[PDB]
Design an enzyme around this catalytic site. Structure first.
Site, PDB file in Angstrom:
ATOM      1  N   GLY A   4       0.853   7.808  -1.561  1.00  0.00           N
ATOM      2  CA  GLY A   4       0.193   6.695  -2.216  1.00  0.00           C
ATOM      3  C   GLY A   4      -0.493   5.274  -0.868  1.00  0.00           C
ATOM      4  O   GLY A   4      -0.763   4.858  -1.186  1.00  0.00           O
ATOM      5  N   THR A   5       0.503   5.426  -0.097  1.00  0.00           N
ATOM      6  CA  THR A   5       0.875   4.340   1.140  1.00  0.00           C
ATOM      7  C   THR A   5      -0.513   4.226   2.156  1.00  0.00           C
ATOM      8  O   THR A   5      -1.438   3.955   2.435  1.00  0.00           O
ATOM      9  CB  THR A   5       1.786   4.043   2.005  1.00  0.00           C
ATOM     10  N   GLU A  12       7.980   1.493   4.946  1.00  0.00           N
ATOM     11  CA  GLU A  12       9.058   1.786   4.393  1.00  0.00           C
ATOM     12  C   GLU A  12       9.776   1.518   5.718  1.00  0.00           C
ATOM     13  O   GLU A  12       9.080   2.122   7.001  1.00  0.00           O
ATOM     14  CB  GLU A  12       9.920   3.221   4.008  1.00  0.00           C
ATOM     15  N   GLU A  29     -21.430  10.300  20.414  1.00  0.00           N
ATOM     16  CA  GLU A  29     -22.339  11.475  21.024  1.00  0.00           C
ATOM     17  C   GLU A  29     -22.226  12.493  19.610  1.00  0.00           C
ATOM     18  O   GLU A  29     -21.646  13.646  20.361  1.00  0.00           O
ATOM     19  CB  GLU A  29     -22.567  12.277  22.207  1.00  0.00           C
ATOM     20  N   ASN A  62       3.237  19.000  14.816  1.00  0.00           N
ATOM     21  CA  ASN A  62       2.534  17.281  15.058  1.00  0.00           C
ATOM     22  C   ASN A  62       2.234  18.282  16.950  1.00  0.00           C
ATOM     23  O   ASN A  62       1.177  17.234  17.268  1.00  0.00           O
ATOM     24  CB  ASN A  62       3.949  16.674  15.797  1.00  0.00           C
ATOM     25  N   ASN A 122      -1.888  20.977   7.244  1.00  0.00           N
ATOM     26  CA  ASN A 122      -0.944  21.988   7.151  1.00  0.00           C
ATOM     27  C   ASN A 122      -0.524  23.741   7.299  1.00  0.00           C
ATOM     28  O   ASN A 122      -0.534  24.070   7.939  1.00  0.00           O
ATOM     29  CB  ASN A 122       0.243  20.956   6.749  1.00  0.00           C
ATOM     30  N   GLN A 132       3.615   7.993   6.669  1.00  0.00           N
ATOM     31  CA  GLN A 132       4.310   8.508   7.137  1.00  0.00           C
ATOM     32  C   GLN A 132       3.565  10.004   8.281  1.00  0.00           C
ATOM     33  O   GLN A 132       4.300  10.330   9.145  1.00  0.00           O
ATOM     34  CB  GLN A 132       5.451   9.043   6.616  1.00  0.00           C
ATOM     35  N   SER A 158      -2.269   9.464   6.067  1.00  0.00           N
ATOM     36  CA  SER A 158      -2.464  10.851   5.530  1.00  0.00           C
ATOM     37  C   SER A 158      -3.317  10.893   3.748  1.00  0.00           C
ATOM     38  O   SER A 158      -2.998   9.385   3.486  1.00  0.00           O
ATOM     39  CB  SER A 158      -0.580  11.357   5.185  1.00  0.00           C
TER      40      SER A 158
END
Ligand SMILES: Nc1nc2c(ncn2[C@@H]2O[C@H](COP(=O)(O)OP(=O)(O)OP(=O)(O)O)[C@@H](O)[C@H]2O)c(=O)[nH]1
Ligand SMILES: Nc1nc2c(ncn2[C@@H]2O[C@H](COP(=O)(O)OP(=O)(O)OP(=O)(O)O)[C@@H](O)[C@H]2O)c(=O)[nH]1
Ligand SMILES: Nc1nc2c(ncn2[C@@H]2O[C@H](COP(=O)(O)OP(=O)(O)O)[C@@H](O)[C@H]2O)c(=O)[nH]1
Ligand SMILES: [Mg+2]
Ligand SMILES: [Mg+2]
Lengths: 230, 439, 430, 95, 41, 439
Positions: free
Chosen positions: F144-145, F71, F254, F228, F206, F11, F140
């Site tokens: 977990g994913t 998901e 390089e 973003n 972040n 995500q 990320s």
């Protein structure tokens, strides 16, 4: 742009009987464009030949005008052009000082089309066999009994090279030059790939080689056109 | 001067012939009614349709095939369908009663009174033909009338003709998904009948075809019609060399040598690519290098057997589209260099490259989009061992207690046929292992 | 006057033929229609060599197209340049070959030999003094190697004195276009040794290597490969049609290119080659011509002339050049490349001079050389048989023509020692 | 031409195509609606003949221009030229 | 000379890969029943 | 001919991946319709779209991207979003169940049922590419994913390709503004996977972006769209050199030879400048004089780590606009003159310079307006040790007595593994302490 866009007046057509001398245009019926010439750009040829380009714009310009001068003295002393009577593409005297003739040479690994990869069509000053051309009716069946027949302005026209027997046509391939964007011009035979068993035709004799049994697609379609008004 | 007569028998044969003939007619441009448009008859004297069509002399074009089936349901549909006026109204012979999944029934009792007409009709059809190159027979192995008339017709044609090459595009039973329960019998007996009387055969099992559609075309609920369409594509690809000019041409006779080192057991495994739908078509390059690689992936295989299990003997490539010949040779190099496929030790050079110019044609209502290249897969390896054994094991398991046998014994079949045939099956389960393996 | 004939067979043999007449038709200034329009009066003096006089002032090639499948010959006549060949000279059956060397030599090909032998004899009888036959075909194909060879074999029984040529495209192991590619060529090859006076071996790999490397082309088509092979053809007889300071008919080359009576397999190369984008940036003259022509990679044989030593070599310079410069470069190349013009035959390079340059170029040469480097090709290419023979079979597709084992075990007995003939004449010294 | 039931037949094959392409648990109307919502970009809810032809080609139903125009006019009673796929998808769901 | 040639005696031995249609070279050694096949000219 | 394949998983990456492409789309003039009409340019220009786009032969360009997530929620919005017609229809891998912020689920049980498709897609993707220079992966670490599938995917590549360099942009938990409760567990175990497997790591925490957004953009209520946008700039910032003309082009190859002195020390932090909105920009001067000076401001760094708390180890800068190179030297020299910024003893030359002419492109409707200059600062410093330390401090308290352990234990991951993590994470820290010592 100025000279190239210089004023040009296509000569009239009487009774639809295009005759040698009348400054005519060459259009691509399928490619919806008119054959255009360039004097500036130089092809990779030791001799003096110049590239050609087909243009969608149909506004009349000198560089898109040629001359149909009798190629060779013949039995047809009457001025109406006859099928299979030799003739040559001549450039307007305004484009270049020296008379320029469109010409093509044979296949070659060294000499090949820049983009199409087929036999290239050359605007050079050579004065040999390489100038001739002869019209041929579009309808495949009529190809035989059109010999010696009159050609009518406004009727579709194909082109083939007498030294090599290849049709001059246009294909959807881009090209780059100063005069905006344009397509290419080259000679080839887009014959219908389907084969015809001509071998058994001869021995059995039902048919002769002269009458062609292989369809020729549209991309070769050209139609001579005269000016709108006299 | 070259023609191929197509012979179809059984439900599957009839449907496959229907689809393939639709494809051929559309590709050659003959309208459904059998009348070409009156603007493209310049080559009508020779043309290309002579390979599958024989001009009547007044315009109509007759397919050079014969349809046989003992069940009137399918034959009736053809006459009442939109192709009614094309086929000859006597060359679609009609049976009287169904064989009902009894290979014994369709080979000695109900087919004796009809096989006679087939021979006469086939001889008459061949007489007009001048340069018969070979015969193609499509049949459903697991179908009563299919195998029975299919086997009897092949056996008769053997003595009737002799050396004429002929290819067998059978439809063997699926590994796990099943349509008939007695398929092991009618499958096994047909094997022996075809073994020494057919020269070349190619497997066309179902599940492999089903998955190929699901993985690529993205149609989660496909019907048999989608299945038949691809088969027609394979037939067209195989026969295009005989009717479209090309730099490299392969004839039906070019197969009995380049892929058949032996007479008795004649079998193959095939695959196709690309199979791309419109929604996934324009967004991809469709390069020659990538297409060939996609061909050897076991996932896209067209038979339920992973070729990786063993050694590849020979493989024939037939391309159609805008493939540059120099690209073809380079592609084969990558296939040889990849270590995931190992050739059976002897293959020295088992590649036959065929290059054709005419692109594949797209039929209305199909799943394939418009493409500018294609590759055909026909290569046999020891991988065809799984198909034969797996059918056999069921045979032994269900024969160990004399089940379903009485349906056969009382119809005329002797008891010894089953005993002898299985010996051939043993003679086929101890074949593809001698070189499957420093000797 | 000392005209010749051509017999090209098989689809492979035919396609090369389709262009050579395309190539020849240009040199003599002839277009497809069969009418004369040339430029130079020398263009037409030696025209009889390849054409016969006909009514209406039109010329037709002295060619015999021979095939066993219908598609090929049906293919050519409907294409450009499809009118030159005489319709009668065509011959074809209704069966085909199917790259089965057996079917092409006993059952089908045997039965039709009458016609081809019928046509070939007539045309040769017509010529005032037959110079010789040049046979082009693909031993890797069926009709060419199988049935084509027999015609080569048979014709010897009628015309013992004339000399032969063979532009045979022997297939290479790198990229094989047929599994049979390595039971049709050699069986035609074996018969080739006892009858073929000379042999030109053109390997496909050389063509693709030739096209990609020097020409700098991106996507060549067989039309690219065909012409380059055809260009070599014009070199062999080039001096046979135009006057020059030093002339040499196809006979004269035969004398100075085969060290021993049977060792008659050569390798050839064509120069100079440059890409479209490279012509201007190169100064073309006599001395850099030698660099290209003598380069091994320029050879059309997959074999590398650096694997062995040159026995004899000849070169026909094309383009008007003086006599001094031609010789001197030979002296340096001989001395500088002495290690290969091996050592028991001094100055094994022959020289030729002609004064008609290929249209559109001012200097080019043609190469015909004999070097043991051909040994590799007859050693490796399909060398697998020696190990793959042991298991006796594939037979059932060839005994269908009555061929027996003895016809095979005998060949090496006759065939064992080509290199064992070529190898020996590579280490020997006075 | 294409006045007779041939237009209805084309719908029958079309309905089969979406039925084959329909995902489990959803009706064909949703499958056709999603494709229409994929092709259209203005989001107004009205598409032209070109968009309709593109949707048909994606489903595999490719026909000559004349047939496409007839099918569009059959459901385009108003003759405005901007058919509403909301009703077009609903009709397929009912059928 | 040297050059090459064919093999041409099929219905001879190995009793299984005999007349197994599949371009499988000539036949199968099976003298030891182990690996390498016969390694067309 | 110089192309880089982009990998996005999880995500966190997907939206940042979403941002990067749009600007990438804008910079080439390829409108979301999939076309690049330009000023009617067809063949009359250079071929620069190779770096991030591929030609399909006629018309559209297909981005070199593969998308991964378990998901379908995130993928669906992109598949039906404003760029629905650009990405390849099937290259958008979609999962079935959410990783539920558990590493064990995302690395051993559910993550092993989707990798096969990922590698298959990548392998084919590399086939089209001819001048592969490396890999860029966005992921990320607090999910977990994210860590799981990303780690497994990276590992797979390590052996499949090996020497091919890798550059990955991760997103670690903020020092104090943090959302997940089990994020630290996934992060550390993620670090082990990428510690010895990735080449160049760019910290992209972040919280730092928020202050950069609030303080300079003067925005008090930023959203995920704003953050973003900044990341896409840097991502476009670092690689823009390879595809446009520049005074001293610098290849992605390089960086490993100019920014990572030792094999294990390969973690680096980023920063960006100048940052100015569309309101107060034209009245300010934006000279190379101070733009470089601001880039070293601790408060302006793109990560929440004070550079004043450690020596500087190696630096690398890229310039854009109309910068005169001599202006580049002048800015650097004074920086060395300043005593606040100090380097380590063993790095004599610690400034790598590159100049690319093209001005940064502006996506309308955003925050950054059209400026004529900018600079990207990417430097590796020993100060980054603290952030790893702070995560370690969090782990110890929440692992002293098995916090949420059973959730991870039951999925299969061994209990002793965590001991492996602590050993590696602390080992790296102890590695960094020694490096900063003076000679
Ligand atoms: N793939 C495919 N298989 C078919 C098709 N039609 C029939 N079959 C095969 O046929 C089997 C069903 O029995 P059939 O062979 O059709 O029966 P039949 O040929 O009509 O013989 P009888 O039923 O005794 O008259 C199935 O298992 C299929 O494998 C078809 O259209 N496509
Ligand atoms: N800056 C930023 N961080 C994000 C974004 N999306 C996710 N993250 C990070 O992801 C962490 C939480 O993980 P998730 O929201 O579950 O996303 P995920 O890593 O894909 O994990 P899954 O939900 O299982 O797919 C947060 O702590 C964020 O730091 C984003 O759009 N911008
Ligand atoms: N160079 C070249 N090789 C060709 C050409 N045509 C065929 N070949 C070669 O011929 C081989 C096949 O020959 P084949 O078809 O069996 O000959 P056929 O039996 O007489 O038709 C292929 O491996 C090709 O490499 C050609 O035009 N040029
Ligand atoms: Mg039935
Ligand atoms: Mg998530």
């Amino acid at each position: 742009l100025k000279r190239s866009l210089g004023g040009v007046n296509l000569s009239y057509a009487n009774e639809g009987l295009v005759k040698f001398g009348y400054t005519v245009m060459i259009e691509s019926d399928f490619m919806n464009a008119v054959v255009a010439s360039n004097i500036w750009d130089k092809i990779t040829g030791t001799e003096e030949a110049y590239g050609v380009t087909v243009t969608s714009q149909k506004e009349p310009i000198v560089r898109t005008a040629f001359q149909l001068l009798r190629y060779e003295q013949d039995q047809y002393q009457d001025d109406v052009i006859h099928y299979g009577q030799n003739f040559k593409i001549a450039v307007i005297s305004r484009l270049s000082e020296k008379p320029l003739y469109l010409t093509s040479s044979h296949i070659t690994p060294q000499k090949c089309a820049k983009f199409s990869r087929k036999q290239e069509v050359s605007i050079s000053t050579n004065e040999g066999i390489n100038s001739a051309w002869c019209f041929e009716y579009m309808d495949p069946k009529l190809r035989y009994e059109m010999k010696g027949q009159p050609v009518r302005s406004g009727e579709p026209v194909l082109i083939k090279h007498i030294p090599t027997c290849q049709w001059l046509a246009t294909d959807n391939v881009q090209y780059n030059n100063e005069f905006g964007q344009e397509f290419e011009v080259f000679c080839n035979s887009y014959q219908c790939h389907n084969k015809t068993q001509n071998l058994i035709a001869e021995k059995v004799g039902r048919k002769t080689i002269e009458t062609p049994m292989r369809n020729q697609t549209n991309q070769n379609t050209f139609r001579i056109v005269t000016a709108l008004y006299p | 001067m070259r023609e191929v007569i197509s012979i179809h028998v059984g439900q599957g044969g009839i449907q496959v012939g229907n689809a393939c003939w639709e494809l051929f007619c559309l590709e050659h441009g003959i309208q459904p009614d059998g009348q070409m448009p009156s603007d493209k008859t310049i080559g009508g004297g020779d043309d290309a349709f002579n390979t599958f069509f024989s001009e009547t002399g007044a315009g109509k074009h007759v397919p050079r095939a014969v349809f046989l089936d003992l069940e009137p349901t399918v034959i009736d549909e053809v006459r009442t369908g939109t192709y009614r006026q094309l086929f000859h109204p006597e060359q679609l012979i009609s049976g009287k009663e169904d064989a009902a999944n009894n290979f014994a029934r369709g080979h000695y009792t109900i087919g004796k009174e009809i096989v006679d007409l087939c021979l006469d009709r086939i001889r008459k059809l061949a007489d007009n033909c001048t340069g018969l190159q070979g015969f193609l027979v499509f049949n459903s192995v697991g179908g009563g009338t299919g195998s029975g008339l299919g086997s009897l017709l092949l056996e008769r044609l053997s003595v009737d003709y002799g050396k004429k090459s002929k290819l067998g595009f059978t439809i063997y039973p699926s590994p796990q998904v099943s349509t008939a329960v007695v398929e092991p019998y009618n499958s096994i007996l047909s094997t022996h009948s075809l073994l020494e009387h057919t020269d070349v055969a190619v497997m066309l099992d179902n599940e492999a075809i089903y998955d190929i559609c699901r993985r690529n075309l993205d149609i989660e609920r496909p019907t048999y019609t989608n299945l038949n369409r691809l088969i027609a594509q394979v037939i067209s690809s195989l026969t295009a060399s005989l009717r479209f000019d090309g730099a490299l041409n392969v004839d039906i006779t070019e197969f009995q040598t380049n892929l058949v080192p032996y007479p008795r057991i004649h079998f193959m495994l095939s695959s196709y690519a690309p199979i791309i739908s419109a929604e996934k078509a324009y967004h991809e390059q469709l390069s020659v290098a990538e297409i060939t690689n996609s061909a050897f992936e076991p996932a896209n295989m067209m038979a339920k057997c992973d070729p990786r299990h063993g050694k590849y003997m020979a493989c024939s490539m037939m391309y159609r589209g805008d493939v540059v010949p120099k690209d073809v040779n380079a592609s084969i190099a990558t296939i040889k260099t990849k270590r995931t496929i190992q050739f059976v030790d002897w293959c020295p050079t088992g590649f036959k490259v065929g290059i054709n110019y005419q692109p594949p044609t797209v039929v209305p209502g199909g799943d394939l989009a418009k493409v500018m290249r294609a590759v055909c897969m026909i290569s046999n390896s020891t991988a065809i061992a799984e198909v034969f054994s797996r059918l056999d094991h069921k045979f032994d398991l269900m024969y160990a207690k004399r089940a379903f046998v009485h349906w056969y014994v009382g119809e005329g079949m002797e008891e010894g046929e089953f005993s002898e045939a299985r010996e051939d099956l043993a003679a086929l389960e101890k074949d593809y292992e001698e070189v499957g393996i420093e000797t | 006057m000392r005209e010749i004939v051509h017999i090209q067979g098989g689809q492979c043999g035919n396609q090369i033929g389709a262009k050579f007449w395309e190539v020849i038709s240009d040199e003599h200034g002839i277009d497809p229609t069969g009418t004369y329009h040339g430029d130079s009066d020398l263009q037409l003096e030696r025209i009889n060599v390849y054409y016969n006089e006909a009514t209406g002032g039109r010329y037709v090639p002295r060619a015999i197209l021979m095939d066993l499948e219908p598609g090929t010959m049906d293919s050519v006549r409907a294409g450009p340049f499809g009118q030159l060949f005489r319709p009668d000279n065509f011959v074809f059956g209704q069966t085909g070959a199917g790259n089965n060397w057996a079917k092409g030599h006993y059952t089908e090909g045997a039965e039709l030999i009458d016609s081809v032998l019928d046509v070939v004899r007539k045309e040769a009888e017509g010529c005032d003094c037959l110079q010789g036959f040049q046979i082009t075909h693909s031993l890797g194909g069926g009709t060419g190697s199988g049935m084509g060879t027999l015609l080569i074999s048979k014709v010897r029984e009628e015309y013992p004195d004339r000399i032969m040529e063979t532009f045979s495209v022997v297939p290479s192991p790198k990229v094989s276009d047929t599994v049979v590619e390595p039971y049709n060529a050699t069986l035609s090859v074996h018969q080739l040794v006892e009858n073929a006076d000379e042999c030109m071996v053109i390997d496909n790999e050389a063509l693709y290597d030739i096209c990609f490397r020097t020409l700098k082309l991106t996507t060549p088509t067989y039309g690219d490969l065909n012409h380059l092979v055809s260009a070599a053809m014009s070199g062999v007889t080039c001096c046979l049609r135009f006057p020059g300071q030093l002339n040499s008919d196809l006979r004269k080359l035969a004398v100075n290119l085969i060290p021993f009576p049977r060792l008659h397999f050569f390798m050839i190369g064509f120069a100079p080659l440059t890409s479209r984008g490279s012509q201007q940036y190169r100064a073309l003259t006599v001395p850099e011509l030698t660099q290209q022509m003598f380069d091994a990679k320029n050879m059309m044989c997959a074999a590398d002339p650096r694997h062995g030593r040159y026995l004899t070599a000849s070169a026909l310079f094309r383009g008007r050049m003086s006599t001094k410069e031609v010789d001197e470069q030979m002296l340096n190349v001989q001395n500088k490349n002495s290690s290969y013009f091996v050592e028991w035959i001094p100055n094994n390079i022959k020289s030729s001079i002609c004064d008609i340059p290929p249209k559109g170029l001012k200097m080019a040469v043609t190469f015909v050389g004999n070097s043991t480097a051909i040994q590799e090709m007859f050693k490796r290419v399909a060398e697998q048989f020696t190990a793959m023979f042991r298991r006796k079979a594939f037979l059932h597709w060839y005994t269908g023509e009555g061929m027996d084992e003895m016809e095979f075990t005998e060949a090496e007995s006759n065939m064992n020692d080509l290199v064992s003939e070529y190898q020996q004449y590579q280490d020997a010294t006075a | 031409y294409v006045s007779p039931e041939r237009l209805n037949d084309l719908e029958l094959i079309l309905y089969e195509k979406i039925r084959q392409k329909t995902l489990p648990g959803e009706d064909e109307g949703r499958t056709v609606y999603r494709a229409f919502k994929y092709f259209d970009i203005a989001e107004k809810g009205v598409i032209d003949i070109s968009q309709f032809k593109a949707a048909l080609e994606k489903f595999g139903c490719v026909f000559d221009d004349k047939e496409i125009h007839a099918l569009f006019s059959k459901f385009d009673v108003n003759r405005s030229g901007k058919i509403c796929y909301d009703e077009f998808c609903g009709n397929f769901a009912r059928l | 000379r040297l050059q090459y040639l064919g093999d041409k005696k099929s219905q001879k031995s190995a009793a299984f890969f005999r007349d197994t249609r599949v371009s499988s070279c000539s036949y199968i050694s099976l003298k030891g029943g182990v690996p390498r096949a016969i390694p067309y000219y």
